[PDB]
Structure formats: C-alpha cells, structure tokens
Amino acid sequence: NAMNDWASLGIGSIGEAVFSKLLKVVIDEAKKFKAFKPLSKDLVSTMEILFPLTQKIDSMQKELDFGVKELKELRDTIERADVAVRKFPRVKWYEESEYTEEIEEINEDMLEFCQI
Amino acid sequence: VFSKLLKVVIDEAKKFKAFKPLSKDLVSTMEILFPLTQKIDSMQKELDFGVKELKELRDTIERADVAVRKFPRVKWYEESEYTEEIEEINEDMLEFCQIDLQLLQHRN
Amino acid sequence: NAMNDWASLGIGSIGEAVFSKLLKVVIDEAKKFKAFKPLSKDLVSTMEILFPLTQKIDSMQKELDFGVKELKELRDTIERADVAVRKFPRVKWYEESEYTEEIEEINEDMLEFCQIDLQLL
Question: Which H helix or E strand runs over B58?
C-alpha cells in the first residue's frame, strides 16, 4: 500500500514496520552488482538469512515495542544498507576500501541482529 | 583478409598504455601472431578457412576485438573479471602462434 | 592580497615569494581526497613537515638570492605538486600505479627540500 511505497524509497519504519519489503529492495539492488562480491556475495548472503526474521517481525508487531534500542537499530541498520547499495554506482576507484569497510560493518551489525 | 583485422585491434589496445594486460601482454603476443596472420593471407587461395583451426582464429581475433573496444567502459569493480577475459584470449592466441601453416596447406 | 590570489591560481612566486601560501592550497586540495592515502596521508604528511621551512622562506625573502638552484626547484616542486593534485579527478582506475609513482616522486623531492639550511643562503 502506502508504507510499501515508502519502503521502496528506503524508509523502513514510520511508526509501523515494513522491514521485509525494504530488505527485498536492498537485496534486488545488491544482486545487480555481480562483479562486486562484498555486495553481490557477502551482503546478499547475510541479508537473505535475515529476510525470514523480517517476514515474522512483520506478522507480530504490536507485541514488541520497536522503541527498544536494538529494534530501532535494526531499521537504522537496514536503511544504512539501502543508502549504501544505492550509491555504489557513484563510488570511486579510490573509495573501494573505504566503501568495502562500510559494507562489512553493515554486514556484521545485521548478523548480531539475528543472535536474537 | 584478416591480417588487417589483427592490426585494428593491435592499434586500439596499444592506446591504453597504463593497463599492462592490454599494452604489455596481449599486444606483445598479437605481434607474434601478426607475421603468421600475414602469411595466412599470402596463402588464402590454397587454404580452406572452413578448417576448424582457422575458424577458431577468426572467433578469437574478434573476441579480442570486442574486449579492447569495450575497455573504456570497464568499471573498477569489473577489473579482475576483465583481466581473466583478456588473459584467456591471450592464452588461445599464444597457442595459435605455434601452428604449421604448411601442415594445413598439405591437408588442402 | 593579489599575491595570495596568485598563490590560489597555483603561482608560487612572481617577484615575491609565496611558497607557504601556495603550499597550503596544495595541502588543502590534497586533503579533499581522504580515501586516496598516497595523496591525503603520505603526501600531506611530507607537505606539513615542509610547511615551516616555506613559512621561514616567506618571512626572510628580502635576504635570499631566489636565483639559486635550491630555492627555484622548491618553488617549482610546490607548483609541480599543485598541478599533480588538481589532476587527480581525471586519473582512471587503470592509472592508479602511474599516478602513485608520480606522487611518490614529488613526495621524495619535497622531503629532500626539508634539509635546506636557510642561513647558508
């Protein structure tokens, strides 16, 4: 509906969560960059492991208070991921290592966000 | 004729001097294949280009053509992916450098 | 001053010496490419250690024969650094090593100019 379109734009939560639809968008953009493996491979792998969790985190929202620091951070981390694959076309050869670290941090954060 | 077709690709690749696989690896070994490509044309009537060996040389010589032509658009992330592409073309071309034209001539 | 604006255009000296002002534009420009360490880290380090020498040259220029190998080549090397850093937006990914060799060379020359004793004129 509406928040589904907000999710396409990269906004994961507006006092309600559509994390599942946002993660699908991020996965589909990162899948496009076959040759950059930190995206196409590592991130798209660890993101795909979280897609089921987000599916459930979408069917059961009232029970949880997304106010919790960890829950807020999950949206924040998923939006960080979106703004990072979206800008990959504009990333310069000299920014490879800088950009790779960023993608790796977004990778690490997302994993510990499944230890729960 | 296709000695000419090797020249146009020897020409384009030499222009990108800083990228060694093109300017120091491929063009080094398109240069050995150059006298031989010339000889093939001196013998065009006698030889049958229908032969598998010559057919492949046409295919590799254009495979090389597409790669050098498309270089200006290879993005930094596509580097290693591209370096194998041409270093696999540079493989097939080196082994073409070690052929007996006389053997094919004898085989009609 | 008009002299400082000339330093900004990449001029190191007209009659007057402006080594320290020009060397700061080149530090600032080099600082813009934070991700490219040979520029933003390696070169800026050397340039910062050269900066006090240039500052002294600028204050005591009334007393220096600027027609000497050492002072002319310093000025020239600072200018060499300027066009080398203004040129980075146009180096392509397959040129990284050539550009790095160019910068490493300027870096070397700029370090060597730190040995200068300003008193020996």
Answer: helix B52-69
